[PDB]
Every structure is written in structure tokens, then in C-alpha cells.
Design a protein around this ligand. Structure first.
Ligand code: GVE
Ligand code: NA
Lengths: 219, 75
């Protein structure tokens, strides 16, 4: 119902790390870049600190039956905007990632900072409509540019650590999915990579249409 | 000659190719095996993204070389 107030069309975005880097900059944020993982468990020590992953996959209806957490931290700790329109997923995934950063290498810039400040206390669905109707964000998105029911749509989601938890931010959902607790001396990326491998098991061994990117400190 | 093309998920696609094949010809063979259109494919050898009009031999790709394939899919 909220989609009825969504204004303008959004283009699809190619899963290219150069493009996601330029989108971060176009939104006004500095200090970060995006690097592609060529193999899922390739060595990534030289990438660290990794601030989040962006994972693309062909969306399957069985995603609807995913069991999610009822942890209190999902409510208290995590910024999340739900999509109101389908084609915004690349920007929605990226902004869900960035608005959960607090790190000395990250500067969101005044546009995303004020956007976060405005939407931080709104319901996730309203946060999403606000994103969708932002002419600044939509402009940047489109400058770089389909029925779920038929399972031929490629979807972007985000993986990010917040406090002691690691979260999958999938903008089709009403809330983040808390995947598990990391550490105190653990590696948050292992929890995300595990979840990504679990999703890959939803398919046959002959599905190869995936892309994985890491958002890292600029180098 | 044989070359091996690996993927994110660990799959290996084996191809029969000539040293004088173009990158574009290689992408076409992968579409034959895997059904991915060449426009959604980027091929990587030694950390270099391989350009369509060049040949395997331009890149020093030899008998039994391994390349990687990463996807450029519109989401
Ligand atoms: N690739 C555009 C976004 C797709 C999407 O929302 O899939 C669920
Ligand atoms: Na910061």
C-alpha cells in the first residue's frame, strides 16, 4: 500500500564494485570503497577492516519461509529501511549498510547524516518510503542504470556487524535478520560467509549467478 | 587445448579452446555450457579483467590455464 506514494522509477544496477564505489561517493559519503570477492572463501585479510558485504543472488520464493530471529538487539541496535518498491534494492542495500557504520574511516556526509537523523526514529517501512522518494538518492542511483513470482529477479542484500551481532539486511523483509553473536575474539565475517553459503544451498550446484562485494576502507 | 574457468561458488567450467580464440569466443563457449550471456560475464586472468577483442595468447593464457569468471548482473 505504501508503494502507491512512491514517486519516480528506479533503474536496475549492475553488480559492479566500481559502480557501488561511485554510488557511495555520489551519496556524499567518503572514506570507503567497494572490492569484489572473486571466490567466496578467498583470502581477505588485506581487505580488513571490512565494514559490510553486499551479496547478489536470484531471489527464490522459498526465501519467504526463512525462519527469522526474535532477538531484542534487532529492535534496539540496528538501522533498517524496508523497500517499498522493487528496483531500489541496490541503493536500499547500500544505505542500510552505511547507516549502520560507526567507524573512524567512515564519514557519511551531510546528506546521509541528516537522512539518518530524520529517519532513525521512524518505522522501517516509512524509512523506506522516505528513501524511495528522495530525489537526491534516486538521481544518484539512476545515473548508474521482473516478477519475483517467476524467480528471475536478482536481489541485493547487505551483511553488517553491529555490536556483538551480525545482521542480514534484506530490504524485502520487515526487519533485519540477526544471524548470530560474534566473538569476543571472533571474526564477524565468518558469520556472514556462513549465511551466504547457507543461501547458496537453496539452489542446485549448477547455479552460478551470484556476486559478492566487500565495502572496505578506501586504499 | 583445455582451459579451466572457476567461479565464486567453486564451480569449474572446462572449455576446449584455441590459443588464438578471442575473449568474446570464450564467453560464447561459457554461454553454451552455463547459459550465461556474454554481457553478464567478466573474465579474469592474473588479476586482469580480460577485454573482448583480445585473444587468449595476448594474455599469455596457455594449455590448462585457470581463469575466473565473475558476474555482472542487473539487480
Ligand atoms: N535488482 C533490483 C532489486 C531487486 C529486488 O528487490 O529483489 C527482491
Ligand atoms: Na566515522
Amino acid at each position: 500500500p505504501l508503494g502507491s506514494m512512491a514517486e519516480g522509477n528506479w533503474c536496475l544496477i549492475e553488480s559492479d564494485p566500481g559502480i557501488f564505489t561511485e554510488m557511495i561517493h555520489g551519496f556524499g559519503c567518503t572514506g570507503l570503497q567497494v572490492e569484489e570477492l572473486v571466490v567466496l572463501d578467498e583470502s581477505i585479510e588485506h581487505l580488513k577492516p571490512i565494514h559490510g558485504f553486499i551479496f547478489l543472488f536470484r531471489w527464490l520464493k522459498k526465501e519467504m519461509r526463512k525462519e527469522v530471529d526474535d532477538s531484542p538487539q534487532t529492535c534496539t541496535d540496528v538501522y533498517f529501511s524496508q523497500q517499498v518498491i522493487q528496483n531500489a534494492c541496490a541503493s536500499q542495500a547500500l544505505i542500510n549498510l552505511l547507516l549502520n557504520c560507526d567507524h573512524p574511516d567512515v564519514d557519511l556526509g551531510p546528506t546521509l547524516k541528516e537522512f539518518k537523523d530524520f529517519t532513525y526514529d521512524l518505522d522501517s517501512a516509512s524509512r523506506g518510503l522516505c528513501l524511495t522518494n528522495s530525489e537526491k538518492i534516486r538521481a544518484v542511483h539512476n545515473s548508474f542504470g521482473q516478477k519475483l513470482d517467476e524467480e528471475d529477479v536478482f536481489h541485493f542484500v547487505t551483511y553488517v556487524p553491529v555490536n556483538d551481532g551480525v545482521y542480514e539486511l534484506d530490504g524485502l523483509r520487515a526487519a533485519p535478520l540477526r544471524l548470530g553473536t560474534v566473538a569476543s575474539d571472533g571474526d564477524w565475517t565468518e558469520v556472514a560467509i556462513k549465511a551466504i553459503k547457507e543461501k547458496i544451498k537453496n539452489y542446485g550446484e549448477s547455479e552460478v549467478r551470484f556476486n559478492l562485494m566487500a565495502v572496505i576502507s578506501d586504499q | 587445448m583445455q582451459i579451466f574457468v572457476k567461479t565464486l561458488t567453486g564451480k569449474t567450467i572446462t572449455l576446449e579452446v584455441e590459443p588464438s580464440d578471442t575473449i568474446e569466443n570464450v564467453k560464447a563457449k561459457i554461454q553454451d555450457k552455463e547459459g550465461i550471456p556474454p554481457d553478464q560475464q567478466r573474465l579474469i586472468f592474473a588479476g586482469k579483467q580480460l577485454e573482448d577483442g583480445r585473444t587468449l595468447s595476448d594474455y599469455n593464457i596457455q594449455k590448462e590455464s585457470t581463469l575466473h569468471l565473475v558476474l555482472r548482473l542487473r539487480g
